[PDB]
Amino acid sequence: TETSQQLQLRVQGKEKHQTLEVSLSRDSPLKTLMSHYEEAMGLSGRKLSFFFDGTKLSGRELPADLGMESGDLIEVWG
After folding, report:
1. List-wise, which residues carry Phosphoserine?
2. SS (H, E, C) the chain
3. How many CB atoms are closer than 10 A to CB 17?
4. Which of 2, 32, 61, 78 is most buried, with most CB under 10 Å away?
């Protein structure tokens, strides 16, 4: 919201059927969310790409670094 401990980000694939939302900590990088997402739908190992506002997320950016907030939209491509 404004004093956000963690940010609730909707991480969704190229398919609209492909659908997750997870709480990423503001200090913790996108990579820990990337690993969480794939584990939920058993893609553990077969890792997929992540985009936000067209920006390719390498993993080593933070959500507070990207300028994200609770109720955002991450995208997934594979």
Report:
1. 28, 49
2. CCCCCEEEEEEEECCCCCEEEEEEECCCCHHHHHHHHHHHCCCCCCCCEEEECCEECCCCCCHHHHCCCCCEEEEEEC
3. 7
4. 61
